[PDB]
Amino acid sequence: AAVEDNHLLIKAVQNEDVDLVQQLLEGGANVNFQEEEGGWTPLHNAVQMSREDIVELLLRHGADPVLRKKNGATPFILAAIAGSVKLLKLFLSKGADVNECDFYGFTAFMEAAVYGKVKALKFLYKRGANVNLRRKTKLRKGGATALMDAAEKGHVEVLKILLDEMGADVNACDNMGRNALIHALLSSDDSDVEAITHLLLDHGADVNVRGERGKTPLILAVEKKHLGLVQRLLEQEHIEINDTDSDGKTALLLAVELKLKKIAELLCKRGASTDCGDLVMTARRNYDHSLVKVLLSHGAKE
């Protein structure tokens, strides 16, 4: 009955129907209603759609400015996702703390990085957001940072702003031991990965970090089948061409097994032919005789 009206209020907000929102609130609908599934409120929804006027309407009807939903997100944090500087500023005047976080450790600054909201990022920075915070949950899915988020998501401009203008530590690691370089290679679209990797390497990113399963940047690039990345990575002075993953396989072995001749040949022109195992055998069983030629030219065995 009244529970129906409360959902109508949220629906009215979602539909951006101001008159209806007013009528329902003046009707006695619970302004702080939380839908049971996600804990969302009319205010959360209003913020998500960047409707400042609807937000102010809800606030004037007594909406709790800092009421969190199930994941712990506040309207303030949602404002960062929406990329709204005005709303971010608004909730800071309402008691929000610039460094507060949802139950997964996500702060506003991180959300801005995740969603590539440049203006929100810059505003939150000047408000004294801790740029280098590592996420505190309440798994080995934590310890991440805004820089890793930007790298993973491919937001090149944000990544630069963090590295150049905001003192982001390029070599911080999450709980899994992964750094921004790893995150960029793990998920970033092939569209932005080269530029992001280039930027990180220039800023002193450690090429010899171990990710999940002992995977290194070099190995991840090989598994990406991306020749450009492998080439860029090998240009690093202190790169370990012979590092092995948990399975004890090197970048070259994987290149051969993955049937990548050009990448494998690149690795040979600098790497180690025996450290990885029976390469010629693998290349031959795959009918790649051209690769067998290269491997033998570099001292492969049988």
Side-chain angles (χ1 to χ4, degrees), residues 1-138 141-302:
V3 178
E4 228 289 87
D5 281 342
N6 294 348
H7 280 277
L8 286 174
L9 177 54
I10 293 185
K11 186 189 304 185
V13 170
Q14 287 181 349
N15 290 336
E16 309 187 53
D17 189 355
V18 177
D19 296 59
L20 186 57
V21 168
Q22 283 185 347
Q23 186 193 184
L24 292 170
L25 286 171
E26 296 176 5
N30 184 8
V31 68
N32 283 321
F33 175 68
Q34 297 189 266
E35 53 81 20
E36 188 57 47
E37 181 178 2
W40 285 66
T41 64
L43 184 54
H44 296 307
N45 282 278
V47 169
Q48 181 177 61
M49 294 180 305
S50 286
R51 290 302 294 262
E52 315 183 30
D53 55 334
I54 299 183
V55 161
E56 193 64 41
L57 174 56
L58 295 173
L59 288 181
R60 296 197 175 190
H61 284 270
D64 187 345
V66 299
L67 182 57
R68 303 167 177 258
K69 52 189 180 69
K70 245 175 184 175
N71 71 352
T74 58
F76 175 66
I77 293 173
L78 290 185
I81 296 184
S84 172
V85 167
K86 275 176 93 174
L87 288 181
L88 289 165
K89 175 181 171 185
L90 174 60
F91 296 114
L92 283 171
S93 78
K94 297 304 182 179
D97 187 84
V98 70
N99 285 306
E100 68 191 25
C101 62
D102 66 12
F103 301 150
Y104 297 101
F106 282 92
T107 66
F109 188 83
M110 303 174 186
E111 296 295 3
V114 169
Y115 288 93
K117 303 303 181 177
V118 175
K119 293 179 179 178
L121 191 83
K122 290 176 177 176
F123 170 83
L124 288 167
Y125 175 76
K126 297 176 180 178
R127 286 279 174 146
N130 189 338
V131 176
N132 293 311
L133 254 180
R134 302 171 68 261
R135 284 199 276 284
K136 162 196 169 182
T137 308
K138 82 181 202 65
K141 168 190 48 184
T145 68
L147 180 64
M148 305 175 191
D149 297 324
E152 160 186 340
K153 292 296 176 174
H155 301 304
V156 168
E157 182 183 354
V158 167
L159 193 92
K160 284 206 299 178
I161 293 173
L162 294 165
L163 294 175
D164 292 334
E165 307 180 28
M166 299 181 175
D169 181 2
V170 66
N171 280 329
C173 292
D174 60 20
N175 292 344
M176 278 254 182
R178 301 167 294 189
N179 62 6
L181 180 57
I182 296 288
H183 278 279
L185 300 167
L186 276 185
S187 46
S188 181
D189 223 58
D190 300 40
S191 309
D192 299 281
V193 66
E194 290 198 69
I196 290 189
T197 299
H198 185 101
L199 281 169
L200 293 169
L201 294 180
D202 286 2
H203 284 78
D206 188 0
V207 288
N208 295 307
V209 285
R210 303 303 208 95
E212 202 172 359
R213 303 250 311 292
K215 305 293 183 179
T216 64
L218 180 57
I219 287 179
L220 291 172
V222 167
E223 293 174 346
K224 256 196 176 305
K225 303 174 186 288
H226 194 107
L227 173 63
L229 289 176
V230 171
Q231 190 170 358
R232 174 59 226 254
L233 290 169
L234 289 172
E235 296 179 357
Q236 298 307 113
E237 190 187 23
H238 300 107
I239 197 170
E240 293 289 286
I241 15 70
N242 296 330
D243 257 345
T244 60
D245 57 6
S246 63
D247 289 312
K249 304 185 175 183
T250 79
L252 178 51
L253 202 225
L254 293 169
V256 178
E257 293 183 345
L258 294 180
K259 294 145 286 193
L260 315 164
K261 185 223 296 180
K262 286 176 178 174
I263 294 182
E265 180 175 346
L266 218 191
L267 290 162
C268 287
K269 293 187 177 183
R270 317 181 180 182
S273 65
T274 173
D275 196 33
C276 20
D278 36 33
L279 301 175
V280 173
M281 181 181 301
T282 302
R284 249 201 279 270
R285 297 196 179 193
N286 284 337
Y287 305 116
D288 189 349
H289 310 281
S290 176
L291 176 52
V292 172
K293 254 99 173 184
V294 179
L295 292 171
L296 294 176
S297 295
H298 292 267
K301 294 175 180 176
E302 315 120 3

mmCIF file of all heavy atoms in Angstrom, residues 206-234:
data_model
loop_
_atom_site.group_PDB
_atom_site.id
_atom_site.type_symbol
_atom_site.label_atom_id
_atom_site.label_comp_id
_atom_site.label_asym_id
_atom_site.label_seq_id
_atom_site.Cartn_x
_atom_site.Cartn_y
_atom_site.Cartn_z
ATOM 1 N N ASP A 206 57.583 -1.042 -12.793
ATOM 2 C CA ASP A 206 58.424 -2.230 -12.680
ATOM 3 C C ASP A 206 57.953 -3.351 -13.607
ATOM 4 O O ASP A 206 56.873 -3.909 -13.417
ATOM 5 C CB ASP A 206 58.456 -2.723 -11.229
ATOM 6 C CG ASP A 206 59.463 -3.840 -11.012
ATOM 7 O OD1 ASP A 206 60.131 -4.239 -11.989
ATOM 8 O OD2 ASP A 206 59.591 -4.315 -9.864
ATOM 9 N N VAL A 207 58.775 -3.678 -14.600
ATOM 10 C CA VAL A 207 58.449 -4.726 -15.564
ATOM 11 C C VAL A 207 58.582 -6.133 -14.988
ATOM 12 O O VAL A 207 58.107 -7.096 -15.589
ATOM 13 C CB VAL A 207 59.335 -4.637 -16.821
ATOM 14 C CG1 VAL A 207 58.932 -3.450 -17.670
ATOM 15 C CG2 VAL A 207 60.808 -4.560 -16.434
ATOM 16 N N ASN A 208 59.233 -6.254 -13.837
ATOM 17 C CA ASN A 208 59.510 -7.566 -13.252
ATOM 18 C C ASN A 208 58.590 -7.944 -12.094
ATOM 19 O O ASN A 208 58.987 -8.696 -11.206
ATOM 20 C CB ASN A 208 60.975 -7.663 -12.815
ATOM 21 C CG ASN A 208 61.936 -7.594 -13.986
ATOM 22 O OD1 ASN A 208 61.807 -8.346 -14.952
ATOM 23 N ND2 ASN A 208 62.903 -6.688 -13.909
ATOM 24 N N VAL A 209 57.370 -7.416 -12.100
ATOM 25 C CA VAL A 209 56.382 -7.765 -11.083
ATOM 26 C C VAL A 209 55.645 -9.054 -11.428
ATOM 27 O O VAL A 209 55.425 -9.363 -12.599
ATOM 28 C CB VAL A 209 55.350 -6.643 -10.887
ATOM 29 C CG1 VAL A 209 55.966 -5.489 -10.113
ATOM 30 C CG2 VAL A 209 54.813 -6.179 -12.232
ATOM 31 N N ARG A 210 55.263 -9.801 -10.396
ATOM 32 C CA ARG A 210 54.528 -11.045 -10.578
ATOM 33 C C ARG A 210 53.049 -10.856 -10.265
ATOM 34 O O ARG A 210 52.689 -10.330 -9.212
ATOM 35 C CB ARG A 210 55.103 -12.139 -9.679
ATOM 36 C CG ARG A 210 56.582 -12.418 -9.890
ATOM 37 C CD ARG A 210 56.870 -12.802 -11.329
ATOM 38 N NE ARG A 210 58.044 -13.661 -11.438
ATOM 39 C CZ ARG A 210 57.992 -14.989 -11.479
ATOM 40 N NH1 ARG A 210 56.822 -15.610 -11.426
ATOM 41 N NH2 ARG A 210 59.110 -15.696 -11.578
ATOM 42 N N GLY A 211 52.196 -11.289 -11.186
ATOM 43 C CA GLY A 211 50.762 -11.259 -10.968
ATOM 44 C C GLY A 211 50.247 -12.618 -10.539
ATOM 45 O O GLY A 211 51.008 -13.452 -10.044
ATOM 46 N N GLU A 212 48.951 -12.841 -10.728
ATOM 47 C CA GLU A 212 48.348 -14.132 -10.434
ATOM 48 C C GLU A 212 49.028 -15.221 -11.262
ATOM 49 O O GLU A 212 49.303 -15.025 -12.444
ATOM 50 C CB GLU A 212 46.850 -14.082 -10.742
ATOM 51 C CG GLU A 212 46.012 -15.132 -10.029
ATOM 52 C CD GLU A 212 44.522 -14.919 -10.230
ATOM 53 O OE1 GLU A 212 44.146 -13.945 -10.917
ATOM 54 O OE2 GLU A 212 43.726 -15.724 -9.701
ATOM 55 N N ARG A 213 49.310 -16.357 -10.628
ATOM 56 C CA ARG A 213 49.919 -17.501 -11.306
ATOM 57 C C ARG A 213 51.340 -17.222 -11.798
ATOM 58 O O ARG A 213 51.798 -17.825 -12.770
ATOM 59 C CB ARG A 213 49.043 -17.968 -12.471
ATOM 60 C CG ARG A 213 47.626 -18.342 -12.067
ATOM 61 C CD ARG A 213 47.399 -19.841 -12.164
ATOM 62 N NE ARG A 213 47.857 -20.367 -13.446
ATOM 63 C CZ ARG A 213 47.283 -20.095 -14.613
ATOM 64 N NH1 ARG A 213 46.224 -19.296 -14.665
ATOM 65 N NH2 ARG A 213 47.768 -20.616 -15.732
ATOM 66 N N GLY A 214 52.031 -16.306 -11.127
ATOM 67 C CA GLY A 214 53.407 -15.989 -11.466
ATOM 68 C C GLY A 214 53.567 -15.309 -12.815
ATOM 69 O O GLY A 214 54.682 -15.184 -13.321
ATOM 70 N N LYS A 215 52.454 -14.873 -13.400
ATOM 71 C CA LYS A 215 52.489 -14.195 -14.691
ATOM 72 C C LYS A 215 53.191 -12.844 -14.594
ATOM 73 O O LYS A 215 52.885 -12.035 -13.718
ATOM 74 C CB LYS A 215 51.075 -13.996 -15.242
ATOM 75 C CG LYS A 215 50.248 -15.266 -15.343
ATOM 76 C CD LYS A 215 50.804 -16.226 -16.380
ATOM 77 C CE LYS A 215 49.915 -17.453 -16.505
ATOM 78 N NZ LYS A 215 50.406 -18.409 -17.535
ATOM 79 N N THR A 216 54.134 -12.614 -15.503
ATOM 80 C CA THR A 216 54.845 -11.344 -15.594
ATOM 81 C C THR A 216 54.257 -10.498 -16.720
ATOM 82 O O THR A 216 53.499 -11.006 -17.549
ATOM 83 C CB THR A 216 56.345 -11.561 -15.874
ATOM 84 O OG1 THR A 216 56.511 -12.171 -17.160
ATOM 85 C CG2 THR A 216 56.967 -12.454 -14.813
ATOM 86 N N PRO A 217 54.598 -9.200 -16.750
ATOM 87 C CA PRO A 217 54.151 -8.333 -17.843
ATOM 88 C C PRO A 217 54.520 -8.904 -19.204
ATOM 89 O O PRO A 217 53.684 -8.917 -20.105
ATOM 90 C CB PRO A 217 54.916 -7.035 -17.586
ATOM 91 C CG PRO A 217 55.091 -7.008 -16.093
ATOM 92 C CD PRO A 217 55.297 -8.446 -15.693
ATOM 93 N N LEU A 218 55.753 -9.377 -19.346
ATOM 94 C CA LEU A 218 56.209 -9.962 -20.604
ATOM 95 C C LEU A 218 55.343 -11.149 -21.016
ATOM 96 O O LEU A 218 54.929 -11.260 -22.171
ATOM 97 C CB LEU A 218 57.671 -10.402 -20.498
ATOM 98 C CG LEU A 218 58.271 -11.044 -21.752
ATOM 99 C CD1 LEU A 218 58.158 -10.108 -22.948
ATOM 100 C CD2 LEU A 218 59.718 -11.440 -21.511
ATOM 101 N N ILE A 219 55.078 -12.037 -20.064
ATOM 102 C CA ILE A 219 54.274 -13.225 -20.328
ATOM 103 C C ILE A 219 52.828 -12.868 -20.670
ATOM 104 O O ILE A 219 52.236 -13.444 -21.583
ATOM 105 C CB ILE A 219 54.304 -14.201 -19.135
ATOM 106 C CG1 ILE A 219 55.668 -14.895 -19.048
ATOM 107 C CG2 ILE A 219 53.193 -15.227 -19.258
ATOM 108 C CD1 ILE A 219 55.795 -15.851 -17.885
ATOM 109 N N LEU A 220 52.265 -11.910 -19.941
ATOM 110 C CA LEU A 220 50.897 -11.470 -20.190
ATOM 111 C C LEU A 220 50.755 -10.891 -21.593
ATOM 112 O O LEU A 220 49.734 -11.085 -22.253
ATOM 113 C CB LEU A 220 50.466 -10.436 -19.147
ATOM 114 C CG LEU A 220 50.274 -10.951 -17.719
ATOM 115 C CD1 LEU A 220 50.033 -9.804 -16.750
ATOM 116 C CD2 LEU A 220 49.130 -11.949 -17.671
ATOM 117 N N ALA A 221 51.785 -10.181 -22.041
ATOM 118 C CA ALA A 221 51.796 -9.604 -23.381
ATOM 119 C C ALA A 221 51.898 -10.700 -24.436
ATOM 120 O O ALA A 221 51.326 -10.587 -25.522
ATOM 121 C CB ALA A 221 52.946 -8.616 -23.525
ATOM 122 N N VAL A 222 52.630 -11.761 -24.113
ATOM 123 C CA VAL A 222 52.734 -12.911 -25.003
ATOM 124 C C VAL A 222 51.386 -13.615 -25.112
ATOM 125 O O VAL A 222 50.965 -14.006 -26.201
ATOM 126 C CB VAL A 222 53.800 -13.914 -24.515
ATOM 127 C CG1 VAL A 222 53.676 -15.235 -25.261
ATOM 128 C CG2 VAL A 222 55.192 -13.329 -24.686
ATOM 129 N N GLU A 223 50.711 -13.770 -23.977
ATOM 130 C CA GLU A 223 49.394 -14.397 -23.954
ATOM 131 C C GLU A 223 48.332 -13.487 -24.570
ATOM 132 O O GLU A 223 47.285 -13.951 -25.018
ATOM 133 C CB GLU A 223 49.016 -14.799 -22.527
ATOM 134 C CG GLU A 223 49.890 -15.912 -21.963
ATOM 135 C CD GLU A 223 49.598 -16.212 -20.507
ATOM 136 O OE1 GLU A 223 48.916 -15.395 -19.852
ATOM 137 O OE2 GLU A 223 50.056 -17.267 -20.019
ATOM 138 N N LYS A 224 48.612 -12.187 -24.593
ATOM 139 C CA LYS A 224 47.763 -11.235 -25.300
ATOM 140 C C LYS A 224 47.948 -11.395 -26.804
ATOM 141 O O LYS A 224 47.156 -10.879 -27.595
ATOM 142 C CB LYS A 224 48.096 -9.799 -24.889
ATOM 143 C CG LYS A 224 47.099 -9.162 -23.932
ATOM 144 C CD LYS A 224 47.283 -7.652 -23.892
ATOM 145 C CE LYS A 224 46.237 -6.985 -23.013
ATOM 146 N NZ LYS A 224 44.850 -7.329 -23.428
ATOM 147 N N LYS A 225 49.002 -12.111 -27.187
ATOM 148 C CA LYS A 225 49.351 -12.295 -28.592
ATOM 149 C C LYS A 225 49.716 -10.957 -29.231
ATOM 150 O O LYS A 225 49.781 -10.839 -30.453
ATOM 151 C CB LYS A 225 48.197 -12.948 -29.358
ATOM 152 C CG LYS A 225 47.739 -14.285 -28.793
ATOM 153 C CD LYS A 225 46.500 -14.784 -29.524
ATOM 154 C CE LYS A 225 45.934 -16.048 -28.887
ATOM 155 N NZ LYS A 225 46.788 -17.243 -29.127
ATOM 156 N N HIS A 226 49.946 -9.950 -28.394
ATOM 157 C CA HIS A 226 50.242 -8.604 -28.873
ATOM 158 C C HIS A 226 51.736 -8.394 -29.116
ATOM 159 O O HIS A 226 52.513 -8.254 -28.173
ATOM 160 C CB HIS A 226 49.724 -7.568 -27.875
ATOM 161 C CG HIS A 226 49.681 -6.175 -28.420
ATOM 162 N ND1 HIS A 226 48.503 -5.545 -28.760
ATOM 163 C CD2 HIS A 226 50.672 -5.294 -28.693
ATOM 164 C CE1 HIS A 226 48.770 -4.334 -29.212
ATOM 165 N NE2 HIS A 226 50.078 -4.155 -29.181
ATOM 166 N N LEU A 227 52.127 -8.359 -30.386
ATOM 167 C CA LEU A 227 53.530 -8.196 -30.756
ATOM 168 C C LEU A 227 54.087 -6.845 -30.315
ATOM 169 O O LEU A 227 55.239 -6.751 -29.889
ATOM 170 C CB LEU A 227 53.705 -8.363 -32.268
ATOM 171 C CG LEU A 227 55.094 -8.055 -32.836
ATOM 172 C CD1 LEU A 227 56.137 -9.014 -32.280
ATOM 173 C CD2 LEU A 227 55.077 -8.104 -34.356
ATOM 174 N N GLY A 228 53.268 -5.802 -30.420
ATOM 175 C CA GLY A 228 53.698 -4.459 -30.069
ATOM 176 C C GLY A 228 54.094 -4.328 -28.612
ATOM 177 O O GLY A 228 55.133 -3.746 -28.289
ATOM 178 N N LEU A 229 53.266 -4.873 -27.726
ATOM 179 C CA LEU A 229 53.543 -4.837 -26.296
ATOM 180 C C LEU A 229 54.812 -5.608 -25.955
ATOM 181 O O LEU A 229 55.660 -5.119 -25.209
ATOM 182 C CB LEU A 229 52.363 -5.399 -25.501
ATOM 183 C CG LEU A 229 51.108 -4.526 -25.454
ATOM 184 C CD1 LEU A 229 49.988 -5.238 -24.712
ATOM 185 C CD2 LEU A 229 51.422 -3.188 -24.807
ATOM 186 N N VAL A 230 54.938 -6.813 -26.502
ATOM 187 C CA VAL A 230 56.119 -7.632 -26.266
ATOM 188 C C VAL A 230 57.364 -6.868 -26.684
ATOM 189 O O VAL A 230 58.370 -6.859 -25.976
ATOM 190 C CB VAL A 230 56.066 -8.952 -27.052
ATOM 191 C CG1 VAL A 230 57.401 -9.678 -26.957
ATOM 192 C CG2 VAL A 230 54.940 -9.828 -26.539
ATOM 193 N N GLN A 231 57.279 -6.219 -27.839
ATOM 194 C CA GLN A 231 58.388 -5.448 -28.372
ATOM 195 C C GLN A 231 58.718 -4.272 -27.458
ATOM 196 O O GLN A 231 59.887 -4.020 -27.163
ATOM 197 C CB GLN A 231 58.051 -4.950 -29.777
ATOM 198 C CG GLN A 231 59.216 -4.331 -30.522
ATOM 199 C CD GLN A 231 58.890 -4.082 -31.980
ATOM 200 O OE1 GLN A 231 57.795 -4.404 -32.445
ATOM 201 N NE2 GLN A 231 59.839 -3.512 -32.712
ATOM 202 N N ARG A 232 57.688 -3.562 -27.010
ATOM 203 C CA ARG A 232 57.876 -2.422 -26.117
ATOM 204 C C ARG A 232 58.486 -2.852 -24.785
ATOM 205 O O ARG A 232 59.383 -2.191 -24.258
ATOM 206 C CB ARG A 232 56.548 -1.696 -25.875
ATOM 207 C CG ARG A 232 56.640 -0.588 -24.835
ATOM 208 C CD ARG A 232 57.667 0.463 -25.241
ATOM 209 N NE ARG A 232 58.542 0.838 -24.131
ATOM 210 C CZ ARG A 232 58.467 1.988 -23.469
ATOM 211 N NH1 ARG A 232 57.560 2.892 -23.805
ATOM 212 N NH2 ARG A 232 59.306 2.239 -22.472
ATOM 213 N N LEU A 233 58.003 -3.969 -24.250
ATOM 214 C CA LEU A 233 58.476 -4.469 -22.963
ATOM 215 C C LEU A 233 59.937 -4.903 -23.011
ATOM 216 O O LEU A 233 60.690 -4.674 -22.066
ATOM 217 C CB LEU A 233 57.595 -5.624 -22.482
ATOM 218 C CG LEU A 233 56.179 -5.245 -22.040
ATOM 219 C CD1 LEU A 233 55.322 -6.484 -21.836
ATOM 220 C CD2 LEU A 233 56.227 -4.405 -20.774
ATOM 221 N N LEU A 234 60.331 -5.532 -24.114
ATOM 222 C CA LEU A 234 61.698 -6.017 -24.267
ATOM 223 C C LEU A 234 62.704 -4.875 -24.377
ATOM 224 O O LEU A 234 63.907 -5.081 -24.224
ATOM 225 C CB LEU A 234 61.807 -6.941 -25.482
ATOM 226 C CG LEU A 234 61.139 -8.308 -25.327
ATOM 227 C CD1 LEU A 234 61.142 -9.065 -26.644
ATOM 228 C CD2 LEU A 234 61.827 -9.115 -24.238
#
